[PDB]
Amino acid sequence: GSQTFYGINYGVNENSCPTVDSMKNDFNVLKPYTNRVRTFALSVCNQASLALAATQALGMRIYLGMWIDRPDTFDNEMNALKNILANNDVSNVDGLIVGSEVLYRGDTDPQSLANYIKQVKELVAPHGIKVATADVYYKFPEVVVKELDFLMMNAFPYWEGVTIDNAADTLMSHYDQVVGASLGKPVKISATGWPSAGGNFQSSVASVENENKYLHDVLCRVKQRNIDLLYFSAFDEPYRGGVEAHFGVLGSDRNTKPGITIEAGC
Ligand SMILES: OC[C@H]1O[C@@H](O[C@@H]2[C@@H](O)[C@H](O)O[C@H](CO)[C@H]2O)[C@H](O)[C@@H](O)[C@@H]1O
Ligand SMILES: OC[C@H]1O[C@@H](O[C@@H]2[C@@H](O)[C@H](O)O[C@H](CO)[C@H]2O)[C@H](O)[C@@H](O)[C@@H]1O
């Protein structure tokens, strides 16, 4: 069952940073279901350095994310990347995700993002690390795609008001659109998930039964087409509030969630 998830997204509380041992304990709980995790920032809580130590001690692999929005974050994250290359083994890194939903938010223009990606690639390619960026299905302009090794899609049919019966079918449809913008490069999925509590979004209903269904459907669909998927997310995160506090496969105290069965639908 350590093949059930290709990988899993792992959240971090910036106002209450973990330790190496605390990360090791967290990743340990996940080991029966996966061998791979993903972090969202390099410098924040020094999380990238600590997660490399934790994954390596446990024999696991990792995707490393760079968090860029405000102008200063471009300098800070690049300096953190340089420190990582000098202070860490990186042989267990499957990719570097340069920004997440940068174009969706309008943090910067397409040409500027392409230039930053180009600089990142020049630094890590001799270390043997492939580069991507993550964004919504309608935000992959050619000028950005030209600089990538591969593409990663964030897509949540829940935030689209899509009903649970149609949700995984819609995910796959959005995937086909990213392929259309891919220039023939490989396409992966960096994030999708479904909340267990916190109300509804139009016809999209939040419940334990629905998260269970969505998990089964997506795992089946990506297996049929040989698509690599990072599920969102590992544990519930209360400090986000409301619906955003209920995306975990497991609970906030690292116990299992009653009603969730971890398995693929085919
Ligand atoms: O802590 C770094 C940045 O994290 C951002 O939230 C992330 C979300 O975009 C993503 O979808 O989920 C992960 C894990 O739950 C979050 O870390 C914040 O929005 C940023 O303000 C923050 O700098
Ligand atoms: O609350 C805003 C959230 O919006 C999400 O983007 C949505 C996509 O996931 C979804 O597939 O499409 C719709 C537009 O058709 C987007 O709004 C982000 O993924 C979240 O990070 C964000 O919090």
Instruction: Identify how many contiguous H helices and E strands the chain contains and give both numbers.
Output: 8, 10
- Residue 38, CA distances (Å) to 183, 197, 231 in order: 25, 24, 10
Give the residue whose CA is nearest to atom 12 of ligand 1: 11
Among 138, 153, 156, which residue has the most ligand 2 atoms within 8 Å of its CB, making it the best to mutate?
A: 156
> What count of other Cβ atoms lies within 10 Å of the Cβ of residue 128?
9
Place of tokens 């089964």: 216
Place of tokens 């819609």: 170
Tell me how far apart the alpha carbons of residues 176 and 193 are, in angstroms, rounded to a whole number. Answer: 18
37 strand-pairing partners: 8, 62
Tell me how far apart the alpha carbons of residues 82 and 137 are, in angstroms, rounded to a whole number. Answer: 31
- What residues line ligand 1, using a CB cutoff of 6 Å? 11, 14, 40-41, 44, 67, 233, 237
- Å from CA of 40 to ligand 1 middle: 7
Q: Resolution (in Å) of the shown entry? A: 2.3
Say which ligand is closest to the CA of 247: 1
Which residues neighbour 76 within 8 Å (Cβ) at sequence distance 6 or greater?
Answer: 43
Residue type, 140: F
Say which ligand is closest to the CA of 243: 2
H/E segment holding residue 30: helix 20-30
Ligand 2 atom nearest to CA at 174: 11
**Would you say 74 and 38 are in contact if contact means Cβ atoms under 8 Å apart?**
no
Helical segments of 31-166, H only: 47-58, 71-87, 102-105, 110-124, 142-145
**Would you say 262 and 1 are in contact if contact means Cβ atoms under 8 Å apart?**
yes
Q: Is 136 in the pocket of ligand 2 (CB under 6 A)?
A: yes
**Would you say 253 and 236 are in contact if contact means Cβ atoms under 8 Å apart?**
no
Report the chain's terminal Cα–Cα distance, integer Å.
14
Tell me how far apart the alpha carbons of residues 26 and 135 are, in angstroms, rounded to a whole number. Answer: 27
Q: Is 156 in the pocket of ligand 2 (CB under 6 A)?
A: yes
Residue type, 99: G
Tell me how far apart the alpha carbons of residues 66 and 81 are, in angstroms, rounded to a whole number. Answer: 9
Tell me how far apart the 2 most distant CA atoms of the chain are, in Å: 50
134 strand-pairing partners: 100, 152
Quote the DSSP letter at residue 250.
B
76 strand-pairing partners: none
Tell me how far apart the alpha carbons of residues 66 and 107 are, in angstroms, rounded to a whole number. Answer: 14
Classify 41 as helix, strand or coil: coil
- Residue 150, CA distances (Å) to 139, 165, 174 in order: 14, 30, 17
Say which ligand is closest to the CA of 230: 1
> What count of other Cβ atoms lies within 10 Å of the Cβ of residue 89?
9
Ligand 2 atom nearest to CA at 136: 8
Tell me how far apart the alpha carbons of residues 137 and 242 are, in angstroms, rounded to a whole number. Answer: 25
Give the pair of three-digit tokens for residue 235. 């544990």
Tell me how far apart the alpha carbons of residues 74 and 58 are, in angstroms, rounded to a whole number. Answer: 31
Tell me how far apart the alpha carbons of residues 249 and 75 are, in angstroms, rounded to a whole number. Answer: 34
Q: Is 201 in the pocket of ligand 2 (CB under 6 A)?
A: no
As a residue count, the chain comes to: 266
> What count of other Cβ atoms lies within 10 Å of the Cβ of residue 112?
12
Q: Is 138 in the pocket of ligand 2 (CB under 6 A)?
A: no
Classify 266 as helix, strand or coil: coil
Tell me how far apart the alpha carbons of residues 148 and 118 are, in angstroms, rounded to a whole number. Answer: 8
- Å from CA of 266 to ligand 1 middle: 32
Torsions phi, psi of 9, nearest 5? -70, 135
Which residues neighbour 120 within 8 Å (Cβ) at sequence distance 6 or greater?
Answer: 66, 78, 81, 96, 98, 131
Tell me how far apart the alpha carbons of residues 266 and 223 are, in angstroms, rounded to a whole number. Answer: 8
Residue type, 146: K
- Å from CA of 182 to ligand 1 middle: 26
